[PDB]
């Protein structure tokens, strides 16, 4: 169970570098300069990519997500 394919931007296969870059690319993708009348979705995506990239990039955070998901 990685779920990264679903959560971020690309499948789990790309190195951690790409994970951070996928966050950045999506950040620009939903950045206010690139967003129309829908700001909620853009910020929502920015917020979820930030947290999701955060947990996957940090090995300790990943397990916290799993343990405190169940808890």
From Swiss-Prot:
Q: In which tissues is it expressed?
A: More abundantly expressed in neocortex, cerebellum, spinal cord and retina where it is expressed by neuronal cells (at protein level). Detected at much lower level in non-neuronal tissues including kidney, lung, heart, skeletal muscle, spleen and testis (at protein level). Isoform 1 is more abundant in neocortex and cerebellum compared to isoform 2 (at protein level).
Q: Which residues carry this modification: N-acetylalanine?
A: 2
This protein's source sits in the domain of life called Eukaryota
Q: What does the entry report about post-translational modification of this chain? A: Ubiquitinated by STUB1; does not lead to proteasomal degradation.
Sequence ranges assigned to domain J in this UniProt record: 2-71
Complexes and interactors: Interacts with HSP70 (HSPA1A or HSPA1B). Interacts with HSPA8/Hsc70. Interacts with PSMA3 and most probably with the whole proteasomal complex.
* Function, as annotated: Functions as a co-chaperone, regulating the substrate binding and activating the ATPase activity of chaperones of the HSP70/heat shock protein 70 family. In parallel, also contributes to the ubiquitin-dependent proteasomal degradation of misfolded proteins. Thereby, may regulate the aggregation and promote the functional recovery of misfolded proteins like HTT, MC4R, PRKN, RHO and SOD1 and be crucial for many biological processes. Isoform 1 which is localized to the endoplasmic reticulum membranes may specifically function in ER-associated protein degradation of misfolded proteins.
**What remark about domains does the record contain?**
The J domain is sufficient to interact with HSP70 (HSPA1A or HSPA1B) and activate its ATPase activity. The J domain is also required for the HSP70-mediated and ubiquitin-dependent proteasomal degradation of proteins like ATXN3. The J domain is required to reduce PRKN cytoplasmic aggregation.
Clinical condition linked: Neuronopathy, distal hereditary motor, autosomal recessive 5: A form of distal hereditary motor neuronopathy, a heterogeneous group of neuromuscular disorders caused by selective degeneration of motor neurons in the anterior horn of the spinal cord, without sensory deficit in the posterior horn. The overall clinical picture consists of a classical distal muscular atrophy syndrome in the legs without clinical sensory loss. The disease starts with weakness and wasting of distal muscles of the anterior tibial and peroneal compartments of the legs.
> What name does UniProt use for this protein?
DnaJ homolog subfamily B member 2
What organism is this sequence from?
Answer: Homo sapiens
Q: What is the lineage of its organism?
A: Eukaryota, Metazoa, Chordata, Craniata, Vertebrata
Shown stretch of the complete protein = 1 to 71 of 324
């Amino acid at each position: 169970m990685a779920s990264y394919y679903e959560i971020l931007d690309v499948p789990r296969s790309a190195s951690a570098d790409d994970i951070k870059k996928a966050y950045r690319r999506k950040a620009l993708q939903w950045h206010p300069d690139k967003n129309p009348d829908n700001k909620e979705f853009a910020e929502k995506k920015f917020k979820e990519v930030a947290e999701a990239y955060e947990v996957l990039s940090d090995k300790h955070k990943r397990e916290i997500y799993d343990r405190y998901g169940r808890e």
